[PDB]
UniProtKB/Swiss-Prot annotation:
Modified residues (PolyADP-ribosyl glutamic acid): 16-17
PTM annotation: Ubiquitinated via 'Lys-63'-linked ubiquitin chains. Deubiquitinated by USP14 with the help of TRIM14 leading to stabilization.
GO molecular function: chromatin DNA binding; damaged DNA binding; histone demethylase activity; histone H3K9 demethylase activity; histone H3K9me2/H3K9me3 demethylase activity; metal ion binding
Organism: Homo sapiens
Function field: Histone demethylase that specifically demethylates 'Lys-9' of histone H3, thereby playing a central role in histone code. Does not demethylate histone H3 'Lys-4', H3 'Lys-27', H3 'Lys-36' nor H4 'Lys-20'. Demethylates both di- and trimethylated H3 'Lys-9' residue, while it has no activity on monomethylated residues. Demethylation of Lys residue generates formaldehyde and succinate.
Chief localisation class: nucleus
Entry protein name: Lysine-specific demethylase 4D
Domain JmjC: 136-302
Reaction catalysis annotation: N(6),N(6),N(6)-trimethyl-L-lysyl(9)-[histone H3] + 2 2-oxoglutarate + 2 O2 = N(6)-methyl-L-lysyl(9)-[histone H3] + 2 formaldehyde + 2 succinate + 2 CO2
Family, per entry: Belongs to the JHDM3 histone demethylase family.
Binding site for 2-oxoglutarate: 126, 192, 200, 235
GO cellular component, one term: blood microparticle
The protein's required cofactors: Fe(2+)
Binding-site positions, Fe cation: 182, 184, 270
Length: 331
């Protein structure tokens, strides 16, 4: 078995190897990458996502989210308070302000220490989940707006034709902006490209050990667990590396820098934080190996997780028993 300790792997494809996205994913899995839940892909030196970022300041963040924490430093939830719209130029200036800017630090480890010590005492503003793309249309390789769609994959593997679409999303971050512990909708893959700015630190639990993280989460967030049998779908819970180590949960960490891709694999729980002002683009995708994960994915039916139009078909086809109850949740 390849990668039996479930380490995060880093790949350096050549420009030739960068042509065929599907083929490269399948290669990385042949080497065991999926066992970690997360891989890094460094693009060939010849590749670029677009020519410059000089002209992005006029993108609108219609609903910036202030991430307000509750709990203790290593075990907390966050709620998202909606804020007034602002442009990316306005958001960048706010990220760089004395109130929100990255503190002085020695290196990424020192910054990580400071994040976990102090995150809860601040409420950073995240421009998350903005439909759009920063890839140039002429970028032909690993252009996250030109991937094969999940609906097309389902149709190719299973024969069934379904409604829905699959488009990318932009994330504008600042220091301490946080993504809570989650897997993707329907335990899909994700791919995330850091277009510019400061790094993003990731934590990940191997898919084969995801239920260990779930059981800890039920212990640590006991009211939320009684409320919903899949409350990590709400994407609000944080648990620090220190707490994971104290409870014996297997995990790994890695820091993504500008110009690098990350892939999350089916049922790979992940969480993390931004180091400073940045912009990432991410989209969900599928392969043949996902189908079985999709059929087994948990679902929130309490009503909190509220998701996309296109998830309806995935539930309807892959999980027809759960469909009725899940749809009651979504209405
Ligand atoms: O970058 C973020 O805030 C969150 N991204 C992801 O969870 C992802 O790409 O799967
Ligand atoms: Mg602009
Ligand atoms: Ni994710
Ligand atoms: Zn729920």
């Amino acid at each position: 078995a390849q990668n039996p300790n479930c380490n995060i792997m880093i790949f350096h494809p050549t420009k030739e190897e960068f042509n065929d996205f599907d083929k490269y994913i399948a290669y990385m899995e042949s080497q065991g990458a999926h066992r970690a839940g997360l891989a890094k892909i460094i693009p060939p030196k010849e590749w670029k996502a677009r020519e410059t970022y000089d002209n992005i300041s006029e993108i609108l963040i219609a609903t910036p989210l202030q991430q307000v924490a509750s709990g203790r430093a290593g075990v907390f939830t966050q709620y998202h308070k909606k804020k007034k719209a602002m442009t990316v130029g306005e958001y960048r200036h706010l990220a760089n302000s004395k109130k929100y800017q990255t503190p002085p630090h020695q290196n990424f480890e020192d910054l990580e220490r400071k994040y976990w010590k102090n995150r809860i005492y601040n409420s950073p503003i995240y421009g998350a989940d903005i439909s759009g793309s920063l890839f140039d249309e002429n970028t032909k390789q690993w252009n996250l707006g030109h991937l094969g769609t999940i609906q097309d994959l389902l149709e190719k593997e299973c024969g069934v034709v379904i409604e829905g679409v699959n488009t990318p999303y932009l994330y504008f971050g600042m220091w301490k902006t946080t993504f809570a512990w989650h897997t993707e909708d329907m335990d899909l893959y994700s791919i995330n490209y850091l277009h510019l700015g400061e790094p993003k630190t990731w934590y990940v639990v191997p898919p084969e050990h995801g239920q260990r993280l779930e059981r800890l989460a039920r212990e640590l967030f006991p009211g939320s667990s009684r409320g919903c049998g899949a409350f990590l779908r709400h994407k609000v819970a944080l648990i620090s590396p220190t707490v994971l180590k104290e409870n014996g949960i297997p995990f790994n960490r890695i820091t993504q820098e500008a110009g690098e891709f990350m892939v999350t694999f089916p049922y790979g729980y992940h969480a993390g934080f931004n180091h400073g002002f940045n912009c990432a683009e991410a989209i969900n995708f599928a392969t043949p190996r996902w189908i079985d994960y999709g059929k087994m994915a948990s679902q929130c039916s309490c009503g909190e997780a509220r998701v996309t139009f296109s998830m309806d078909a995935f539930v309807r086809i892959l999980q027809p028993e759960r469909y009725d109850l899940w749809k009651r949740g979504q209405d």
